[PDB]
């Protein structure tokens, strides 16, 4: 019900978008071909879309406060205006006019728009060199891919932490420890429970003075420039919206070219043979800085090559 999405007086956004969206009213038709194109159906879907994009989120919202309590301190970023699109491939269309033809990612329980942690993990890993599997259809792309990603991640690591030199093996071990929580060659490392990188679900945290959802058009003009283009309507997260990124990251210890846990690294330090030139460390703060720089560089969501889901610092 109107603005200020709260746990007390508000309809579930996912329920409105997916379940209540295609509800049958006494005098609304979208089964026959005439009904889908009629202005009665357009008005029905316009009212539904207004209800969807008539909700605000306060900064001190109890939902976001609960998220902060559960998932630790958030990494807050802002939305540029292409908007932000997540879950675009979900099936949501009937062939009608004025309806949202693209899917959207809504949390089931809360209804707040969110980015699943899997999307964050994949986007962050995509700029790491070992995000591509050998397979055999990758063989040609694999050498160049790893090279450019190695250079990019090397400059990022030298930027964010006080390490003046890193190697390809060290980058491999760091990436595998961060994402797979293992070693590049299979076998695992005896990590502590705390020493584990978790990528929670990014959530909408603050729609300052406006709504959080907007409606946008992509109009693919066909390969025949003499035929009529297709207006496609979808739902986007509004620009200048605070998206909270929640992570559970640890400190990574790299001695020589291998990743070490804290228990192993204590004994390695206490050994009579040691080399500060071989012991590298990436603090959880520097890990968060690295992830923030990656997110600023590439962004999150769908249609990111078109620009959707790019961020600045808040």
């Amino acid at each position: 019900m109107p603005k200020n999405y709260t746990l007390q007086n508000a309809s579930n956004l996912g329920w409105l978008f997916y379940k209540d969206y295609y509800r049958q009213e006494p005098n609304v038709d979208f089964i026959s071909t005439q009904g889908k194109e009629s202005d009665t159906t357009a008005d029905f879907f316009r009212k539904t879309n207004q209800r969807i994009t008539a909700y605000q989120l306060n900064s001190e919202s109890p939902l976001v406060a609960a998220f902060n309590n559960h998932f630790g301190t958030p990494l807050q970023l802002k939305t540029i205006y292409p908007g932000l699109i997540t879950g675009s491939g979900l099936p949501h269309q009937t062939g009608s006019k004025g309806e949202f033809k693209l899917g959207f990612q809504f949390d089931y329980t809360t209804g707040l728009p969110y980015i699943p942690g899997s999307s964050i993990k994949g986007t962050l890993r995509s700029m790491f060199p070992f995000s591509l599997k050998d397979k055999g259809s990758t063989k040609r792309i694999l050498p160049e891919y790893r090279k450019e990603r190695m250079e990019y991640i090397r400059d990022l690591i030298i930027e964010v932490t006080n390490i003046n030199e890193i190697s390809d093996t060290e980058i491999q071990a760091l990436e595998y420890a961060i994402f797979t929580n293992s070693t590049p060659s299979g076998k695992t490392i005896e990590f502590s429970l705390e020493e584990k990188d978790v990528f929670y679900d990014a959530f909408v945290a603050d729609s300052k003075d406006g709504v959080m959802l907007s409606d946008d058009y992509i109009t693919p003009h066909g390969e025949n420039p003499l035929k009529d283009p297709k207006p496609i309507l979808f739902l986007k997260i509004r620009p200048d919206v605070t998206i909270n990124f929640y992570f559970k990251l640890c400190t990574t210890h790299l001695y020589k070219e291998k990743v070490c846990s804290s228990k192993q690294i204590e004994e390695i330090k206490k050994q009579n043979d040691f080399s500060s030139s071989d012991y590298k460390m990436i603090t959880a703060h520097q890990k968060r800085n690295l992830f923030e720089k990656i997110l600023l560089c590439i962004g999150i969501g769908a249609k990111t090559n078109i620009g959707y889901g790019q961020l600045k610092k808040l």
Partner: protein, 282 residues
């Protein structure tokens, strides 16, 4: 380098459908496909297919079999959020007296859509009204909500940023080479062919861009035709007046081309008509 951070200048206002956001700027949904097409056309030395084979060999394509898309990330962001918002119509009407500073009127323009917002309708942005002293010389009034609910606004912003990201350095070098030509050749917006898309790039990677407009136009277009419009003094005042002259001249000339001009009292025949009735006079 893996990033291209270009600063580009706005020459003519852009008609934007999503103007309700203060961050409204150039949409990369228009730039990226057109830029990909332009880049591949330049790669093949005028042929799109040869450029596609070129990008296929150098692994610059997202897909090597289906589409024309190149692998890079396009981002366009506003640096300063102040916008000069224009109303674009087809006829000339009396200007309002009460008027926000951001609001200017390009009345006689090729863009003839949304002509009804300067009517007597209650949904018109500028509601026309009879004058009391003279039962002519219509009066003008401004409705804030109607101007807020307009479908399309003509927007002009200050210098802003277009950011190009890719992990393929050679593609970035060729993008740096061809981006000024791309922006000098293409217009972006609604009715962009008539001039509501004009941009030029000033700084590419914090380096000034000495790109001759005439030479790039000569290269990428079959015919290029210059018209020196008499800039009656000014040139330091009333960019709104400059826009009015420019777009009134464009409407003049393009109405002359494919039609006549049965306006005031001077008649000049349609040159589109005169071409066909002369060549093989049937």
């Amino acid at each position: 380098m893996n990033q291209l951070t270009a600063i580009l200048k706005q020459h003519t206002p852009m008609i934007h459908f999503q103007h309700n956001e203060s961050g409204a700027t150039l949409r990369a949904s228009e730039v990226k496909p057109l830029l990909d097409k332009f880049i591949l056309t330049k790669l093949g030395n005028g042929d799109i297919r040869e450029g596609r084979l070129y990008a296929k060999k150098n692994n610059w394509l997202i897909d090597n079999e289906k589409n024309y898309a190149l692998n890079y990330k396009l981002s366009i962001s506003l640096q300063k959020k102040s916008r000069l918002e224009y109303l674009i119509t087809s006829s000339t009407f009396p200007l309002p007296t009460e008027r926000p500073s951001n609001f200017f009127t390009i009345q006689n323009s090729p863009y003839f859509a949304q002509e009804k917002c300067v009517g007597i309708n209650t949904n018109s942005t500028i509601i026309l009204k009879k004058s009391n002293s003279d039962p002519r010389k219509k009066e003008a009034e401004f409705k804030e909500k109607n101007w807020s609910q307009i479908d399309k606004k003509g927007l002009e912003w200050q210098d802003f940023t277009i950011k190009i990201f890719s992990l393929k350095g050679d593609l970035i070098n060729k993008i740096q080479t061809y981006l000024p030509a791309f922006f000098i050749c293409h217009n972006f917006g609604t009715r962009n062919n008539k001039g509501f898309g004009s941009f030029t790039v000033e700084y590419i990677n914090n380096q000034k861009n000495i790109c001759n407009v005439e030479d790039t136009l000569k290269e990428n277009f079959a015919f290029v035709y210059k018209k020196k419009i008499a800039l009656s003094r000014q040139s330091t005042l009333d960019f709104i007046y400059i826009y009015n002259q420019i777009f009134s001249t464009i409407k003049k000339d393009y109405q002359i081309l494919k039609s006549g001009y049965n306006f005031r009292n001077e008649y000049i025949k349609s040159l589109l008509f005169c071409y066909f009735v002369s060549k093989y006079p049937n």
